[PDB]
């Protein structure tokens, strides 16, 4: 009764409110690393900086789709690669859903990109040519945008499914939690799940990183 | 051929071998927040700093329990109280297991265990009287002892359930990326699953925070 359980769940909701928890008007963004699209590129004829996703990430966007078929989805939103749309079009499949496709969300620019070689930089070391504050502010724009376009969900919360790349989707959690390149010093596994909660211009990191849907499979589709 | 995609893949693997993602001898531990005990709690006849799961937290359980039904478990480690136990005897009895205690994963020592009123701190500020240093020590030791009391499978991935409390949970994972108190700035949900990949005396922080096996339950679930 009058023996701190109050003040202490009060202030535990206090808590929960900041990061958008027991508030009303929130929506989901669940952001989708693409599934694998690099085993067999070195032998690829396609365009080896947009190929499609590999035997492996078919295996891969498979499981990450039947995981999210009961989940409600109300948008699935992707970047324009190749291996980004066929992910996307393997969640949205179960949904009813139409991809609708960002240019914007495409990954950082890399020197492959720019037809340079590629170098392993040491831990903390900012490995791109586009700046990580211009790849932060273009996927929080693409991702407020994309809420902005979907409609309120008439039965509880809103939730927006957007693939796109891991280096980028990286980039924005961290600069949502003012941290810089190497500070969250995780890579994103591809189709991992990451969950952010927004409302209006608010977004907050909810979950990061979950490729779970991989646990019980066989090791040539990790 | 020879077109810089091969600079590419090379890196890309060095960098999924620094994250332990790819690589043969990896084991994981699943921390794991136990389910609510909170809903109802100004009205429980108990004790309610060591109460049992509300009927919220038994359906959180549930769900908890049928999402890692078919995730391969080698064994399960709860905290002392009641509500991790709880959580923690919903996913054991399904893969064949007794719940294993150690108290070196029980929560952060808070005003309320102390007979202060709980104070809302700033974000940023150490809301706990026991020390972050410590907690992330006792975390670290209570985690590699769960890792080495678990015989390697030999099938796949070894796994090790860790249902504990949020904010040590969160401690230790801000702790194993050399970030203090408010850096890694995330609340993790009840039931929440987080990943750590471990070889060796690495631990690398794989995913944080998922509790998507809540996204398809009634709204009085969260
Ligand atoms: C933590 C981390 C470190 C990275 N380091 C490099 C690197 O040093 N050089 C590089 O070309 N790409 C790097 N990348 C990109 C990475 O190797 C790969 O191209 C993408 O992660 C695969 O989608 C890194 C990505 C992350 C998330
Ligand atoms: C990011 C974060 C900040 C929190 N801030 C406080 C706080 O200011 N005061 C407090 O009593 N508990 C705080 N807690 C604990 C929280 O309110 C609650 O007691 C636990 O999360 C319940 O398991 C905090 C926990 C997290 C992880």
Do not use: C
């Amino acid at each position: 009764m009058s023996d701190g359980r109050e003040s202490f769940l009060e202030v535990m909701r206090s808590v929960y409110e900041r990061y958008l928890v027991g508030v009303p008007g929130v929506s989901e963004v669940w952001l989708i690393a693409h599934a694998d699209s690099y085993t067999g590129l070195e032998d690829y004829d396609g365009d080896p900086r947009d190929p499609a996703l590999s035997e492996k990430g078919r295996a891969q966007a498979r499981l990450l789709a039947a995981r999210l078929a009961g989940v409600p989805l109300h948008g699935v939103w992707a970047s324009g690669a190749h291996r980004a749309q066929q992910t996307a079009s393997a969640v949205a499949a179960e949904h009813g859903l139409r991809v609708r496709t960002d240019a914007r969300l495409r990954e950082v620019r890399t020197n492959w990109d720019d037809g340079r070689p590629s170098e392993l930089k040491p831990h903390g070391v900012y490995p791109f040519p586009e700046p990580e504050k211009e790849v932060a502010e273009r996927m929080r724009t693409a991702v407020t945008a994309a809420v902005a376009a979907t409609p309120p969900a008439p039965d509880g919360t809103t939730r927006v499914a957007v693939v796109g790349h891991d280096s980028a989707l990286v980039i924005l959690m961290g600069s949502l939690m003012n941290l810089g390149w190497g500070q969250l010093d995780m890579i994103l596994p591809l189709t991992s799940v990451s969950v952010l909660a927004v409302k209006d211009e608010r977004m907050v990191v909810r979950s990061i990183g979950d490729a779970t849907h991989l646990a019980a499979a066989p090791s040539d589709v990790i």
